[PDB]
Design a protein around this ligand. Structure first.
Ligand SMILES: C=C(O[C@H]1[C@H](O)[C@@H](CO)O[C@H](OP(=O)(O)OP(=O)(O)OC[C@H]2O[C@@H](n3ccc(=O)[nH]c3=O)[C@H](O)[C@@H]2O)[C@@H]1NC(C)=O)C(=O)O
Ligand SMILES: *[C@](C)(OP(=O)(O)O)C(=O)O
Ligand SMILES: [Mg+2]
Length: 422
């Protein structure tokens, strides 16, 4: 398929950039549209990404009518018909995030048939927390011929203690709870900004979701939900990716309408490294003097800690700072695959299980590399900007899941980058 070609060196990024709506907010927000038995749900600021198309097919497969106006970045959903129960293998096998329809299907229909996710390269990714939480709400779970078969005679409230603050599990449980009979309390809940945005939509739909953004979410079930119009929160990871890009290239970039609160730990690490990050009326400005960049230690953690979704991109920045940086990835077990590819560009890194050491200032060269996953793809492209020579980034299927027009936005900021058909 396509390749991204980058002429490395002298790619100082200067200018302004517009950021898309959050891919990881839109996926669960689309799942939530299934809950509205009256009216229509309209999502605004929807990015054009392959994961969105898949989620639209999943929701559509449940007899909800989904109309995606790409140019207007609008998704309109009519879920007033009789909603069906199945999230098939053909979708779940291409995007394990599809299982966030499990909760809302159970809330609306009382039974669900959702394909069990298999293997994913970035880590083990079990869903025990989803199922255990659902069982506490009165859901009877079986596994039949590859499908999670779930039935709720009387979906009800429960006091759920999460072993880990799973984003996906918190979303499924929140959504299931909106139409349950009783009060659901999710302790040690995911606190991510996408959780907050989901709660905002649900409440505007007539739900009673409280404490989103805190360690405890309380949902009081109601009989039905209605349609509403919701502006999808800005993609903090795309925003953070451009902040990192500006930093690595000694740039001066304004990330339009960026939310400071959604990138606190990234910004704190950029500041500690020696980058300037300034809040202005029109957005967040990142300015960098390359010679002042100093190595840092980073440990990924559940929000409000440093996001795993900024890890790969941040390791690219670590290649340019002075000294030995350390990246500790605690969220996923196998999310340093991009460093294997970066070895092809001359980058030496020392990986001891969850810890990667990267000495800054190594002389990197352009090379043909292959994306291993969404954020890794971005990290390779960013590295191509600062390496000497031409970098060719392939397996863009991964990139297209979460970045829209990445090459175009970078080119508009001054980078020598193109997307060519191979
Ligand atoms: C990589 C992606 O984004 C990811 C993002 O990295 C992570 C963490 O912030 O949260 C979402 O995944 P997710 O919902 O599977 O993440 P979580 O459930 O929080 O998983 C975090 C960790 O908890 C563990 N976990 C999760 C659920 C569970 O039942 N048991 C369990 O042990 C997982 O193995 C994982 O190692 C994003 N995906 C979406 C669609 O929201 C992507 O864009 O495809
Ligand atoms: C991982 C990335 O899971 P997903 O594609 O999101 O279902 C994989 O398939 O390697
Ligand atoms: Mg996959």
């Amino acid at each position: 398929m396509d390749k991204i070609v980058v002429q490395g060196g002298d790619n100082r990024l200067v200018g302004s950039v517009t950021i898309e709506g959050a891919k990881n907010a839109v996926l669960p927000l689309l799942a939530a549209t299934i809950l509205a038995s009256e009216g229509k749900t309209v999502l605004q600021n929807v990015p054009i990404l392959s994961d969105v198309f898949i989620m639209n097919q999943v929701v559509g497969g449940l007899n909800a009518k989904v109309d995606f106006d790409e140019e207007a970045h609008l998704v309109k959903v009519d879920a007033t018909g009789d909603i069906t129960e199945e999230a098939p293998y053909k979708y779940v096998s291409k995007m394990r995030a599809s299982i966030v329809v499990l909760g809302p299907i159970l809330a609306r229909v009382g039974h669900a048939k959702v394909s069990m996710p298999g293997g994913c390269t970035i880590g083990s990714r079990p869903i025990d927390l989803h199922l255990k939480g659902l069982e506490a709400m009165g859901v009877k779970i079986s596994q039949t011929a590859g499908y999670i078969e779930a039935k709720a005679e009387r979906l009800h409230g429960a006091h759920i203690y999460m072993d880990f603050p799973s984003v996906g599990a918190t979303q499924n449980l929140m959504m299931a709870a909106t139409l349950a009979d009783g009060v659901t309390v999710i302790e040690n809940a995911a606190r991510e900004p996408e959780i907050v945005d989901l709660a905002i939509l649900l409440n505007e739909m007539g739900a009673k979701v409280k404490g989103a953004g805190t360690e405890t979410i309380t949902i009081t079930g109601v009989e039905k939900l209605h349609g509403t119009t919701h502006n999808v929160v800005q993609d903090r990871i795309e925003a953070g990716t451009f902040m990192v890009a500006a930093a690595m290239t000694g740039g001066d970039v304004l990330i339009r309408d960026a939310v400071w609160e959604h990138n606190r730990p990234l910004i704190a690490k950029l500041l500690e490294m020696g980058v300037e990050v300034i809040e202005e009326d029109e957005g967040i400005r990142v300015r960098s003097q390359l010679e002042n960049l100093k190595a840092v230690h980073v440990k990924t953690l559940p929000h409000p800690g440093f996001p795993t979704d900024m890890q790969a991109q941040f390791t690219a920045l670590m290649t340019v700072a002075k000294g030995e940086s350390t990246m500790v990835e605690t969220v996923f077990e196998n999310r340093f695959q991009h460093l294997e590819e970066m070895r092809r560009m001359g980058l030496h890194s020392e990986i001891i299980r969850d810890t990667a050491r990267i000495v800054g200032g190594q002389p990197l060269q352009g090379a043909e590399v292959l994306s291993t996953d969404l954020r890794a793809s971005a990290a390779l492209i960013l590295t191509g900007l600062v390496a000497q020579g031409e970098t060719v980034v392939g397996k863009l299927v991964h990139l297209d899941r979460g970045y829209y027009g990445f090459h175009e936005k970078l080119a508009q900021l001054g980078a020598k980058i193109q997307r060519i058909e191979a």
